[PDB]
Amino acid sequence: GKTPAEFAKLNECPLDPGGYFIVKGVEKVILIQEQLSKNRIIVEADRKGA
């Protein structure tokens, strides 16, 4: 909620995207993961073809 005028006092860039953490001085980003849905019927052909 700060305006750029106040951003200037904190030594931050108004254009900065944010959304990361600062831990011991380094900026860390928790990336988006990807995975299959649960509770779904899957029909699959075995390595033997069954």
Partner 1 sequence: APIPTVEEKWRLLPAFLKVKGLVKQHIDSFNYF
Partner 2 sequence: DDPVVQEIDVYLAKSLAEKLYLFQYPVRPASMTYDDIPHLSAKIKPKQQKVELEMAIDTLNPNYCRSKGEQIALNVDGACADETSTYSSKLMDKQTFCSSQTTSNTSRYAAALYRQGELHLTPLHGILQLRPSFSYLDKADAKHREREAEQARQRRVQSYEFLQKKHAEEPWVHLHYYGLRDSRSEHERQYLLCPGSSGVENTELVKSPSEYLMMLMPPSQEEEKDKPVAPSNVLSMAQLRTLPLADQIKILMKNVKVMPFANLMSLLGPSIDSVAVLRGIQKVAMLVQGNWVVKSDILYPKDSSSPHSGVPAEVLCRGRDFVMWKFTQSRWVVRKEVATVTKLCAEDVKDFLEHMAVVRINKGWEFILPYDGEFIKKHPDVVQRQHMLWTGIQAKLEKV
Residue 20 touches partner 2, criterion: CB under 8 A = no
**Which region among 3-11, 13-21, 36-44 touches partner 1 (by CB under 8 A)?**
13-21
Q: Are 12 and 19 in contact (CB under 8 A)?
A: no
* C-alpha to C-alpha distances, 17 to 12, 32, 40, 41, 42, nearest whole angstrom: 11, 16, 37, 40, 40
**Which region among 1-9, 19-27, 35-43 touches partner 2 (by CB under 8 A)?**
1-9
Nearer Cβ to partner 1 (26/32): 32
Give the closest residue to 3 by CA, choosing from 20, 21, 12, 22.
Answer: 12
Residue 25 contacts which entry, partner 2, partner 1, none (Cβ below 5-8 A, type-dependent): none
